[PDB]
Amino acid sequence: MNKFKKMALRVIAESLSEEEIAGLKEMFNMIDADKSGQITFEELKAGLKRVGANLKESEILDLMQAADVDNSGTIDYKEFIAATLHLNKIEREDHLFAAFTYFDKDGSGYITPDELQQACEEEELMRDVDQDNDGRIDYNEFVAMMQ
Ligand SMILES: [Ca+2]
Ligand SMILES: [Ca+2]
Ligand SMILES: [Ca+2]
Ligand SMILES: [Ca+2]
């Protein structure tokens, strides 16, 4: 069974599109705030909410411990991807994150008006979408727009 389960997880991972992969990479980088290549518990607690999940602290610790299979005390990129496949709340958003990272041309984590204009080669916009008035659209505001 566990074998079959592992086989299914591999199918899912292999079935991710390259655009979904780029989205997951942006998610990872968003959480890995110091760009160290490794996500710590502190980063995970600060960052999960930004990628649309915001679990309870105890739930985040459970995720951290399950994902950290080499007991590094950190989540690396490969561990992160594997983990998203075990958390519906996150993996269900892979397509939305693919779309967000497409608009977020510079991988800044926020869509700016200039990026909006770049995309429209494809600004009442900002008023209804930018809910916190920082002049940028973050992932959560993007999801809310999509609804
Ligand atoms: Ca880090
Ligand atoms: Ca690890
Ligand atoms: Ca940006
Ligand atoms: Ca904003």
Curated annotation (Swiss-Prot):
Residues 19-54, 55-90, 91-122, 123-147 form the EF-hand domain. It is found in: Peroxisome membrane. Changing residue 4 to A: Abolishes activation by calcium. Ca(2+) 2 binds at residues 68, 70, 72, 74, 79. Ca(2+) 1 binds at residues 32, 34, 36, 38, 43. Ca(2+) 4 binds at residues 130, 132, 134, 136, 141. May play a role in signal transduction pathways that involve calcium as a second messenger. Phosphorylates the Ca(2+)-ATPase ACA2 resulting in the inhibition of its calcium activation. Belongs to the protein kinase superfamily. Ser/Thr protein kinase family. CDPK subfamily. Interacts with 14-3-3 proteins. This is Calcium-dependent protein kinase 1. The chain holds residues 433 to 587 of 610 of the full protein.
